[PDB]
Amino acid sequence: VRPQVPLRPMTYKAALDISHFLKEKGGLEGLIWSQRRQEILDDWIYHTQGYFPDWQNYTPGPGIRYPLTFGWCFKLVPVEKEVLVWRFDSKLAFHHMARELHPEYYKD
Amino acid sequence: DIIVVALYDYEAIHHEDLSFQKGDQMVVLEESGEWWKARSLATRKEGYIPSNYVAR
């Protein structure tokens, strides 16, 4: 029904607002992660809001995967080849956790 | 002076965007880029809108 909206860059503020909207709407929190579900979400954001799927990557495992794009406030947490669930963390709004653990990704 | 009509439903996620429904009339305030700042004639809410979702 809706066509493709014009493209725009991702920002810290836009990542915050998309994070908050997903927490308010429901659906992402507690959901088991899968590549197929990650594609459905990324492509939805892209068709509805025009952000290319280049901002929804996390730190490589093991353990908790932290978002690479500062402003994205969901993290992937293992539960007991892992099994991960989406979890909102408000600390992520103010602590760039990936840059704290992998400075090399952001030094240049 | 620049009145546009909505062709599709749009739900805004980003806080500085303007939601609307099929048929809503809006005044365009700014046209810098492909996302235009517009104002609703019904609610007088203001925000950016996907320029290809609207006509005239």
Side-chain angles (χ1 to χ4, degrees), chain A residues 1-22 24 26-35 37-38 41-63 65-80 83-90 92-106 108, chain B residues 1 4-33 35-36 38-56:
Chain A
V1 171
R2 307 176 172 192
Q4 166 76 54
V5 310
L7 178 137
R8 48 175 166 178
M10 171 62 58
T11 64
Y12 166 86
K13 172 68 151 36
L16 261 180
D17 291 349
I18 294 170
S19 295
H20 289 310
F21 168 80
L22 291 188
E24 185 170 27
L28 198 55
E29 175 90 10
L31 202 56
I32 314 269
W33 186 93
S34 117
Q35 188 63 82
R37 293 180 178 174
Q38 172 98 309
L41 174 64
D42 264 309
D43 284 320
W44 183 77
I45 305 290
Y46 179 46
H47 304 336
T48 316
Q49 304 306 333
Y51 302 108
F52 195 75
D54 60 10
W55 55 276
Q56 244 220 282
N57 301 281
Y58 310 81
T59 63
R65 324 299 184 85
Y66 289 98
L68 299 183
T69 297
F70 190 32
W72 181 237
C73 294
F74 282 94
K75 64 187 179 183
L76 306 186
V77 173
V79 197
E80 299 87 325
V83 151
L84 311 173
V85 297
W86 271 284
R87 290 273 162 229
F88 192 91
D89 191 18
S90 22
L92 298 178
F94 300 88
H95 286 80
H96 203 179
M97 203 52 61
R99 182 153 175 156
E100 289 184 31
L101 300 178
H102 286 256
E104 41 174 340
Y105 298 163
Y106 308 92
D108 56 58
Chain B
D1 204 77
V4 290
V5 223
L7 304 178
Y8 314 96
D9 302 325
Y10 177 62
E11 174 192 41
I13 313 302
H14 194 231
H15 287 185
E16 278 68 36
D17 294 332
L18 174 58
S19 311
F20 52 83
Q21 299 174 326
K22 206 192 304 216
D24 284 4
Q25 308 160 230
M26 293 168 274
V27 169
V28 165
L29 306 167
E30 179 195 31
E31 262 190 346
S32 287
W35 288 79
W36 302 343
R39 185 192 306 120
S40 161
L41 293 187
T43 45
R44 295 195 109 261
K45 300 189 174 192
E46 294 180 13
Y48 291 99
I49 57 170
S51 69
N52 65 323
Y53 276 42
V54 294
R56 165 182 201 75

